Design an enzyme around this catalytic site. Structure first.
Site, PDB file in Angstrom:
ATOM      1  N   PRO A   1       0.798  -1.232   0.000  1.00  0.00           N
ATOM      2  CA  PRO A   1       0.000   0.000   0.000  1.00  0.00           C
ATOM      3  C   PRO A   1       0.830   1.280   0.000  1.00  0.00           C
ATOM      4  O   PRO A   1       1.948   1.305   0.519  1.00  0.00           O
ATOM      5  CB  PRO A   1      -0.804  -0.102   1.302  1.00  0.00           C
ATOM      6  CG  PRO A   1      -0.835  -1.535   1.625  1.00  0.00           C
ATOM      7  CD  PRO A   1       0.459  -2.102   1.141  1.00  0.00           C
TER       8      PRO A   1
ATOM      9  N   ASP B   1      10.738   0.233  -0.808  1.00  0.00           N
ATOM     10  CA  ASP B   1      10.422  -1.193  -0.710  1.00  0.00           C
ATOM     11  C   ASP B   1      11.441  -2.141  -1.359  1.00  0.00           C
ATOM     12  O   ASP B   1      11.310  -3.346  -1.228  1.00  0.00           O
ATOM     13  CB  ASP B   1       9.028  -1.461  -1.313  1.00  0.00           C
ATOM     14  CG  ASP B   1       8.882  -0.950  -2.738  1.00  0.00           C
ATOM     15  OD1 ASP B   1       9.851  -1.056  -3.524  1.00  0.00           O
ATOM     16  OD2 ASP B   1       7.784  -0.444  -3.064  1.00  0.00           O
TER      17      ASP B   1
HETATM   18  C1  LIG Z   1      12.092  -4.010   2.717  1.00  0.00           C
HETATM   19  C2  LIG Z   1      10.903  -3.311   3.377  1.00  0.00           C
HETATM   20  C3  LIG Z   1      10.774  -3.332   4.761  1.00  0.00           C
HETATM   21  C4  LIG Z   1       9.699  -2.691   5.351  1.00  0.00           C
HETATM   22  C5  LIG Z   1       9.498  -2.669   6.870  1.00  0.00           C
HETATM   23  N1  LIG Z   1       8.831  -2.085   4.566  1.00  0.00           N
HETATM   24  C6  LIG Z   1       8.979  -2.079   3.256  1.00  0.00           C
HETATM   25  S1  LIG Z   1       7.724  -1.204   2.275  1.00  0.00           S
HETATM   26  C7  LIG Z   1       6.165  -1.033   3.207  1.00  0.00           C
HETATM   27  C8  LIG Z   1       6.213   0.168   4.154  1.00  0.00           C
HETATM   28  O1  LIG Z   1       5.632   1.164   3.867  1.00  0.00           O
HETATM   29  N2  LIG Z   1       6.957   0.021   5.399  1.00  0.00           N
HETATM   30  C9  LIG Z   1       7.091   1.061   6.406  1.00  0.00           C
HETATM   31  C10 LIG Z   1       7.738   0.730   7.584  1.00  0.00           C
HETATM   32  C11 LIG Z   1       7.897   1.674   8.584  1.00  0.00           C
HETATM   33  C12 LIG Z   1       7.421   2.958   8.403  1.00  0.00           C
HETATM   34  C13 LIG Z   1       6.776   3.292   7.223  1.00  0.00           C
HETATM   35  C14 LIG Z   1       6.227   4.695   6.998  1.00  0.00           C
HETATM   36  O2  LIG Z   1       6.764   5.547   7.979  1.00  0.00           O
HETATM   37  C15 LIG Z   1       8.007   6.156   7.739  1.00  0.00           C
HETATM   38  C16 LIG Z   1       8.734   6.613   8.831  1.00  0.00           C
HETATM   39  C17 LIG Z   1       9.961   7.222   8.649  1.00  0.00           C
HETATM   40  C18 LIG Z   1      10.469   7.382   7.371  1.00  0.00           C
HETATM   41  C19 LIG Z   1       9.749   6.931   6.276  1.00  0.00           C
HETATM   42  C20 LIG Z   1       8.520   6.317   6.458  1.00  0.00           C
HETATM   43  C21 LIG Z   1       6.613   2.345   6.226  1.00  0.00           C
HETATM   44  N3  LIG Z   1       9.996  -2.677   2.648  1.00  0.00           N
END
Ligand SMILES: Cc1cc(C)nc(SCC(=O)Nc2cccc(COc3ccccc3)c2)n1
Ligand SMILES: [Zn+2]
Length: 296
Positions: free
Chosen positions: A44, A117
């Site tokens: 998403p 991602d």
């Molecule tokens: C390899 C991989 C691993 C993961 C944990 N996620 C992804 S993509 C999915 C996704 O949106 N994940 C996610 C995880 C944490 C926080 C946030 C949004 O909040 C922030 C906070 C600080 C900076 C930027 C964004 C989004 N890909």
């Protein structure tokens, strides 16, 4: 030039863009991509309300979980949110593999992405090909200036799922994913590459971004005046705000901007088909998807 000079597209349609791409005039393509190219991979857009960032992490306020200052003194909410939002699989989309084909076909100058991602990498874009404008989960670093030990995603993943706050093995400081938090500057690479690449671009392919977040959005204004710009997106984006120049798709002065409205996968499939690349794209995707599905 602008609308007053000879235009590079013979018509302002996907068909015109495809003819341009297979002409000698078009050698170097820059892709600008956002969350819209990964939704079909089941990731998403956390900026879309329909997803929306349910968060009783007991924050002093909602925005704190995005702020670097708050993270450094209270990292647990972020890493709890990271476990919750961790994708169950990393399977790049048709759009991602279309960019890999661009690379294979010798047309890809650079992919500037707002996504964190890592799907561009999984799809076969290499670091040299990429500007991860909002950073990435692909690598993490110890936050201590005198250390800055780098850790791979495999290490960070284990910490995230085990619900152990990641600490540096060398100095026991916090380890932060290389994503840009609020309060952090965009990577120096973003500005360095932008300054050089847009001197060299023949085509802007803007996919899956509403061009609302700055300074990423300002990239379209850095193209030479003649450079065609194709938007593949669910909604028209990038036009100047009549309240507060940008894309001109529809006026009598329109000369280089084209909007294809729909899902990014479908637009890229349509463009590949025009280019005679449909079989190549199908074969690449089904092969890579099969490989990912079979990871043991
Ligand atoms: C390899 C991989 C691993 C993961 C944990 N996620 C992804 S993509 C999915 C996704 O949106 N994940 C996610 C995880 C944490 C926080 C946030 C949004 O909040 C922030 C906070 C600080 C900076 C930027 C964004 C989004 N890909
Ligand atoms: Zn350290």
């Amino acid at each position: 030039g602008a609308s007053g000079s000879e235009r590079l597209l013979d018509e302002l349609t996907l068909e015109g863009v495809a003819r341009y791409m297979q002409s000698e005039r078009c050698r170097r393509v820059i892709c600008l991509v956002g969350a819209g190219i990964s939704t079909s991979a089941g990731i998403p857009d956390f900026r879309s309300p329909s997803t929306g960032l349910l968060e009783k992490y007991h924050l002093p306020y909602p925005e704190a979980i995005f702020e670097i200052s708050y993270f450094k003194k209270h990292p647990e909410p972020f890493f709890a949110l990271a476990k919750e939002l961790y994708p169950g699989q990393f399977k790049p989309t048709i759009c991602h593999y279309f960019m890999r084909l661009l690379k294979d076909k010798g047309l890809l100058l650079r992919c500037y992405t707002q996504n964190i991602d890592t799907l561009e990498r999984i799809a076969g874009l290499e670091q040299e090909d990429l500007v991860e404008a909002h950073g990435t989960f692909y690598t993490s670093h110890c936050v201590s200036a005198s250390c800055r030990h780098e850790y791979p995603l495999s290490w960070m993943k284990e910490k995230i799922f085990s619900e152990v706050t990641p600490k540096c093995e060398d100095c026991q400081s916090l380890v932060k994913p290389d994503i840009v938090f609020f309060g952090e500057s965009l990577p120096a690479r973003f500005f360095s590459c932008m300054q050089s690449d847009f001197l060299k671009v023949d085509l802007l392919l803007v996919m899956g971004t509403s061009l609302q977040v700055q300074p990423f959005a300002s990239l379209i204004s850095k193209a030479p005046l003649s450079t065609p710009r194709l938007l593949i997106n669910k909604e028209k984006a990038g036009q100047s705000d009549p309240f507060l120049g940008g894309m001109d798709f529809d006026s009598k002065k329109a000369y280089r901007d084209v909007a294809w409205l729909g899902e990014c996968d479908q637009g890229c499939l349509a463009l590949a088909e025009l280019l005679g690349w449909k079989k190549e794209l199908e074969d690449l995707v089904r092969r890579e998807h099969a490989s990912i599905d079979a990871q043991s």
